[PDB]
Amino acid sequence: TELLKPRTLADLIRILHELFAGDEVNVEEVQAVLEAYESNPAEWALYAKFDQYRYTRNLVDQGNGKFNLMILCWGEGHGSSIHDHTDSHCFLKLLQGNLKETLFDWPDKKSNEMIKKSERTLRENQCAYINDSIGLHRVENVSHTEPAVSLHLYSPPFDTCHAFDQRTGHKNKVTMTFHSKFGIRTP
């Protein structure tokens, strides 16, 4: 063990490599380390590539295959589907701005409105955690004036998930794409 405060994004990545050296994941330790990194915009500007129309996913590190670390850039009003995480751990840390997270239960096979179980505002530097056992969520930048930037870690990596129709609970498979990888736009 001996978790130390990451001094920089680079230092955080190094620490994460250590924490994912094995086949299991200490969720509380990973969350603690992510939370302890104090966002420094100069360190992640390279990855903070926005799109006018929707949020972008910008790959930072491939975690020697154990995890993907990426930065998501949310324009004003940009948000996600209600989605799962494909049997992976998902950590979400705010680097800039605020995001609203809404939780949903897994739908029953009957077609019904998905009612929100709860919501919270994730603030700068806070780190949230979700997995399929916890439930489903939507993440949204509700701000009209401030873009948000978040750092996401998923283990194992996954590039598909399901989006859920809020009116019915019906799910559709979605393939996730990257806007950039290692600072390089990937069209």
Positions at the binding site for Fe cation: 83, 85, 137
180-181: strand order across its sheet: 127-130, 89-96, 148-155, 68-74, 56-61, 180-181, 184-185
In degrees, rounded to 5, the angle at the alpha carbon of residue 158 between the alpha carbons of residues 43 and 26 is 70
Tokens of 53: 């129309």
Half-sphere exposure in the Cβ direction for 144 (13 Å, CA): 0
Q: Rounded to whole angstroms, how far apart are CA atoms 93 and 84? A: 18
User: 139 and 101 in contact (C-beta within 8 Å)?
Assistant: yes
Q: Detail the residues annotated as belonging to a binding site.
A: 83, 85, 137
* Nearest alpha-carbon partner for 163 in 142, 133, 136: 136
Largest CA distance in the chain: 49
* Nearest alpha-carbon partner for 104 in 113, 92, 94, 117: 117
